[PDB]
From a paper:
To save energy and precisely regulate cardiac contractility, cardiac muscle myosin heads are sequestered in an ‘off’ state that can be converted to an ‘on’ state when exertion is increased. The ‘off’ state is equated with a folded-back structure known as the interacting-heads motif (IHM), which is a regulatory feature of all class-2 muscle and non-muscle myosins. Hypertrophic cardiomyopathy (HCM)-causing point mutations in human β-cardiac myosin, the motor that drives heart contraction, result in hypercontractility of the heart.
We solved the near-atomic resolution IHM structure of human β-cardiac myosin-2 (CarIHM) via single-particle cryo-EM using a recombinant uncrosslinked protein preparation with ATP bound. The dimeric cardiac myosin construct we used comprised two heads (human β-cardiac motor domain followed by the lever arm with human β-cardiac essential (ELC) and regulatory (RLC) light chains bound to the target HC sequences IQ1 and IQ2 respectively) and 15 heptads of the proximal S2 coiled-coil. We thus obtained the high-resolution structure of the sequestered off-state (IHM) of human β-cardiac myosin at a global resolution of 3.6 Å (map 1). The nucleotide bound in each head is clearly ADP and Pi, which are trapped after hydrolysis of ATP. In the cardiac IHM, both heads have the lever arm primed and their motor domains are highly superimposable (rmsd 0.7 Å). Their structural state corresponds to a classical pre-powerstroke (PPS) state (rmsd ~0.84 Å with 5N6A35,), defined by the structure of the motor domain from the N-terminus through the Converter ending at the pliant region. In the IHM structure, both heads are in the same conventional prestroke conformation, and it is the interactions between them that slow their activity. The structure reveals five main stabilizing regions within the asymmetrical IHM: the head-head interface, the coiled-coil/BH, and three interfaces involving the lever arms: the RLC/RLC, the BH ELC/RLC and the FH ELC/RLC interfaces. The head-head interface is formed by close interactions between the Mesa of the FH head with two BH actin-binding elements, loop-4 and the HCM-loop, as well as residues on the surface of the U50 subdomain previously designated as the primary head-head interaction site (PHHIS)20. The unexpected head/head interface variations are related to major differences in the orientation of the two heads of the IHMs: when the CarIHM and SmIHM are aligned on the BH, the CarFH is rotated ~20° anticlockwise compared to the SmFH.
Residue numbers in the entry:
A (entry chain D): 39 to 195
B (entry chain A): 3 to 202, 214 to 624, 645 to 906
C (entry chain B): 857 to 898
Write the structure that this text describes.
């Protein structure tokens, strides 16, 4: 939405420039980044927004605009600073309290199948390949995933 | 219309467009004049009431006819706001004309899947819609009963979700008359599950291709259907704990053995016979060395030889491809077609009286040579065995002398038995291939029973199919009407019993129970002195005049002779006893069997590796199926044949109305409205409904389950006169459970949108680090290339590299350093493997002890059952 | 060489135990089918 010129510090400008140049998927260019790739860069650079939020900050664009037109590093930078300042994230106790109700006995573990189902088709729809690749290495023998370890691994990583 | 963007071109075939709804709301109506009136030619007709003179109420039909009726005009129409309704139980007025016309309008708009109460109702399109594309499946992932338009994929998804949540095995039962799409729906469910598994090896491909493999052998053409299912099937899909596909298996039931050698005028034989004769594979026709013309053999050319609706060439191609992908070797495939060619060659046997002495001799031996070579048998030995069976009486092998009739019947019986062993070996092989490792956790079983049939000539193998249809319909009646009307009493819920009048036990007791028709058939089957005519007479002396289901034969309008009329649920059938005794006994030529065990082909040997009347075995298998079903949660998908002439679109009201009456679709919705369809335990409800009103249930205040549920329910804004309370069960009504689920869905949806944002941000971060290290690796590669350019190939570094083998001290030190670090890795691997092995071994000890105790009680209960059956006398 | 022999033997034993526990699953589901059979008998 609104664009603010000065919401930064000079060193993180250099850090963000290094991040963008070393992450720019297109090799033939150096300075421009795909419109659909800008959201991925923002998610990957330490701040995690929602689909609705990233749509709102991006001016509600179209998927064709996402995958066709480009963006510039310092044009997308103020939006990065705005997202970093937003910090619309919960905490450990809130996360485990919300995720606790996904059980029938309160033993501290939840089934992998129900966790996948609620991650995919209960809220913001998640791509399947994502739901398998995020749970790789943390799956247990019988699927009873200890949600506390899961969320602490999520936030730690 | 804003949604359904992922349904693609199938969208108009799932839910009506918004503009159609808007114009439907503008439809003229009265709600005081619009009624339904019974008709003689058709079933029901829309009408407008012109006058109501006391009891008589004159009305004009939609076709302009003026009629009056004795208080039957009270049958009321429905406001135009209810049309093409997905969940048909939501109608304010619900009755026979309402359901009939809702289905009529939907099918006219090419709307086949409907939700009637808790069960799906589907009408055969007879026109392959594009609604089954993989895009539709991708759109149906996770959709609920109301979040999606009615479809078979949504029924499968509901079953999968119930299996995940209730932690219980599920059973999708497909029901309907002959040629009602049951095989189509079964294959579509299998496709849905297989493609969902394929979203995330070749197991899905094998389970998909399993169905055509059995289509070739068991699915033949009959009068009613061109791809009729002769054998009932139950396909079980074992799912892992994670939810990923784990394994699968198939259980198949009795195949129509008389079809192999005998077909009526309008029928064909099993499609494998005619698939080879299409000569799409030249190698098959000449390695079998059979003639291309299908009329040359007398087993497969008695009725019809081909149907325009079926193109056999690509059918054979598909069968070959399915056999290839299933893992079958070339030798097995070639031997199977060899045995099939032997089956059609057996029809060419010619036998004549030797010296008019009532003894059979081979009139022709060339076809006998063909049959002998195909199995690798001995032609002289086979001919001697057929002409002279060497039955052993006492300890003496006395040769029996039989005429041409007995030897030809023996040849037919051998063909039937070997083809049945063929089919069962195929089922075992596919089950072995599909039953891979880790068949753990719960299962979903799709049940496809043989459809009800009424041919012109009814006999045995037409009574077993009708009987199993009766049995499954009675199971549906039990699980809908009786079971819930007793869970009402057991839970202490205020309810009054309702006589739905659908309990099929008198007909089943007339058949299944001892002293019944098939029971006395089994007992008389052991008597060689008895004949069909006496047995039939016995039927008239044991059941006629006592039970209403049994009745004298009809023999209407010069139809083929019928022997007794059985009043099944789907109309009245009329059977013939002639041929039942030998069909039930199924004798076989022991000498020919012994020839089979010493055949060249390992296949023929393993079919006859060893050699229980068929009726008793079928009854036992049927009861086993019902016991499996009673231990699983049923999802009913009832199928309805629109028209008997296989014309797409057209519906005849009497036929569809009659099959909905018989299937009990109408009375299965009264209990879905007048009763309590939904129910859940107090503990689970409180555990997974906390977010709805956490204020009413403080943390650690789980003192009482019932009180907690009561205060959670009252603390919400929902209607409180809808639910009832009972011992560890709350009884909901209508979509109230869906309402609670959707408030939970929206709250947990905000929460999980936050969680998913976090999770996919972390995924983006880890992919960021992956791309960073990939770019750093490429940077290192180009840096080494830059070093190479710096040196290139000046012989000074050549001397350096020649020196390197002379001075390898640091290289050896790094060698031993890597060696000792991998020593540490190997050692820790050793200890972890040993610990895992000892845990596995103690689990083995515990499990084997448990299974030994289970086997002991298995033997004890088998002996107890034997004693109880002995005491039954 | 000795450590490699020990590791190979341990891994082979682990693999045969894995297939053995798969067989234990096979026979345990067979035994639940048998249990269903006795419930059919009654
Ligand atoms: N959804 C459908 N789309 C197209 N054809 C269908 C559909 N359902 C059934 N049919 C047709 O109906 C006929 C009978 O189907 P089938 O599954 O063999 O019935 P049943 O198993 O009851 O004998 C076949 O011609 C089949 O192609
Ligand atoms: Mg069928």
């Amino acid at each position: 939405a609104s664009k603010i010129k000065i919401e930064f510090t000079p060193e993180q400008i250099e850090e963000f420039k290094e991040a963008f140049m070393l992450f720019d998927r297109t090799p033939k260019c150096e300075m421009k980044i795909t419109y659909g790739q800008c959201g991925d860069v923002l998610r990957a650079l330490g701040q995690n927004p929602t689909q609705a939020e990233v749509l709102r900050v991006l001016g509600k664009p179209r998927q064709e605009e996402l995958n066709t037109k480009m963006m510039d590093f310092e044009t997308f930078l103020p939006m990065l600073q705005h997202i970093s300042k937003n910090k619309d994230t919960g905490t450990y106790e809130d996360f485990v309290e919300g995720l606790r109700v996904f059980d029938k006995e309160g033993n501290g573990t939840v089934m992998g199948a129900e966790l996948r189902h609620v991650l995919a088709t209960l809220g913001e729809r998640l791509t399947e390949d994502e739901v398998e690749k995020l749970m790789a290495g943390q799956e247990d023998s019988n699927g009873c995933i200890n949600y506390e370890a899961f969320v602490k691994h999520i936030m730690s990583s | 219309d804003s949604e359904m963007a992922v349904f693609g071109a199938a969208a108009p075939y799932l839910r009506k467009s918004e503009k159609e709804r808007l114009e439907a709301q503008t439809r003229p109506f009265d709600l005081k004049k619009d009624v339904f009136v019974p008709d003689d030619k058709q079933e029901f007709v829309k009408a407008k009431i012109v006058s109501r003179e006391g009891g008589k109420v004159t009305a004009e039909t939609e076709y302009g006819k003026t009629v009056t009726v004795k208080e039957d005009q009270v049958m009321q129409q429905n406001p135009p706001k209810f049309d093409k309704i997905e969940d048909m139980a939501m109608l304010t007025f619900l009755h026979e004309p309402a359901v009939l016309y809702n289905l009529k309008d939907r099918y006219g708009s090419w709307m086949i899947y409907t939700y009637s109460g808790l069960f799906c109702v589907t009408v055969n399109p007879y026109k392959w819609l594009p609604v089954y594309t993989p895009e539709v499946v991708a759109a149906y992932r996770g959709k609920k009963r109301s979040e999606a338009p009615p479809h078979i994929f949504s029924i499968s998804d509901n079953a999968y979700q119930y299996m995940l949540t209730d932690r219980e095995n599920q059973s999708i039962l497909i029901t309907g008359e002959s040629g009602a799409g049951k095989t189509v729906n079964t294959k579509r469910v299998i496709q849905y599950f297989a493609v969902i598994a394929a979203i995330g090896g070749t197991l899905e491909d094998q389970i998909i291709q399993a169905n055509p493999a059995l289509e070739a052998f068991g699915n033949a053409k009959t009068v009613r259907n061109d791809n009729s299912s002769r054998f009932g099937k139950f396909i079980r899909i074992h799912f892992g704990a994670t939810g990923k596909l784990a394994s699968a298996d198939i259980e198949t039931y009795l195949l129509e053995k008389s079809r192999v050698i005998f077909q009526l005028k309008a029928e064909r034989d099993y499609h494998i016979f005619y698939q080879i004769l299409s000569n799409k594979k030249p190698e098959l026709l000449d390695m079998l060395l059979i003639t291309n013309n299908p009329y040359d053999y007398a087993f497969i050319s008695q009725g019809e030889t081909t149907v325009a609706s079926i193109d056999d060439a690509e059918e054979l191609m598909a069968t070959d491809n399915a056999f290839d992908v299933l893992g079958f070797t070339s030798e097995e495939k070639n031997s199977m077609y060899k045995l099939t060619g032997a089956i059609m060659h057996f029809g060419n046997m010619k036998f004549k009286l030797k010296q008019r002495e009532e003894q059979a001799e081979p009139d022709g031996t060339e076809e006998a040579d063909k049959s002998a070579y195909l199995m690798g048998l001995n032609s002289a030995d086979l001919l001697k065995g057929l002409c002279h069976p060497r039955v052993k009486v006492g300890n003496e092998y006395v040769t029996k002398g039989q005429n041409v009739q007995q030897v030809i019947y023996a040849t037919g019986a051998l063909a039937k038995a070997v083809y049945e062993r063929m089919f069962n070996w195929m089922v075992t092989r596919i089950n072995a291939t599909l039953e891979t490792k880790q068949p753990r956790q719960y299962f979903i079983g799709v049940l496809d029973i043989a459809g009800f049939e009424i041919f012109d000539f009814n006999s045995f193998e037409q009574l077993c199919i009708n009987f199993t249809n009766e049995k499954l319909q009675q199971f549906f009646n039990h699980h809908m009407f009786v079971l819930e009307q007793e869970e009402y009493k057991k839970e202490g819920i205020e309810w009054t019993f309702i006589d739905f009048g659908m309990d099929l036990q008198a007909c089943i007791d007339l058949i299944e129970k001892p002293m019944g028709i098939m029971s006395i058939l089994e007992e008389e089957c052991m008597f060689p002195k008895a004949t069909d005519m006496t047995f039939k007479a016995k039927l008239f002396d044991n059941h006629l005049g006592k039970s209403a289901n049994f009745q004298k034969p009809r023999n209407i309008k010069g139809k083929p002779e019928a022997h007794f009329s059985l009043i099944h649920y789907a109309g009245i059938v009329d059977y013939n006893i002639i041929g039942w005794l030998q069909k039930n006994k199924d004798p076989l030529n022991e000498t020919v069997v012994g020839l089979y065990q010493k055949s060249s082909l390992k296949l023929l040997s393993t079919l006859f590796a060893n050699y229980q009347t068929v009726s008793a075995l079928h009854r036992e298998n049927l009861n086993k199926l019902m016991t499996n079903l009673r231990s699983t949660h049923p999802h009913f998908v009832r199928c309805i044949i629109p028209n008997e002439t296989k014309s797409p679109g057209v519906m005849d009201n009497p036929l569809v109305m009659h099959q909905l009456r018989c299937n009990g679709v109408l009375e299965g919705i009264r209990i879905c409205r007048k009763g309590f369809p939904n129910r859940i335990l107090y503990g689970d409800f409180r555990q997974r409904y906390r977010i709805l009103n956490p204020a009413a249930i403080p943390e650690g205040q789980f003192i009482d389950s019932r009180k907690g549920a009561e205060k959670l329910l009252s603390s919400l804004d929902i209607d409180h006169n809808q639910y009832k309370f009972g011992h560890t069960k709350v009884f909901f009504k209508a979509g109230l459970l869906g309402l609670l689920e959707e408030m939970r869905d929206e709250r947990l949806s905000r929460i999980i949108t936050r969680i998913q944002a976090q999770s996919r941000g972390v995924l983006a971060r880890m992919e960021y680090k992956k791309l960073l290290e990939r770019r750093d690796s490429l940077l290192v590669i180009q840096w080494n290339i830059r070093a190479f350019m710096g040196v290139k190939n000046w012989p000074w570094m050549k001397l350096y590299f020649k020196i390197k083998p002379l001075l390898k001290s640091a290289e050896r030190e790094k060698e031993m350093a890597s060696m000792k670090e991998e020593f540490t890795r190997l050692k820790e691997a050793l200890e972890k493997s040993e610990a895992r092995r000892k845990e596995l071994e103690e689990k083995m000890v515990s499990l084997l002890q448990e299974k030994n105790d289970l086997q002991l009680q298995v033997q004890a209960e088998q002996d107890n059952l034997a004693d109880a059956e002995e005491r039954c006398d």
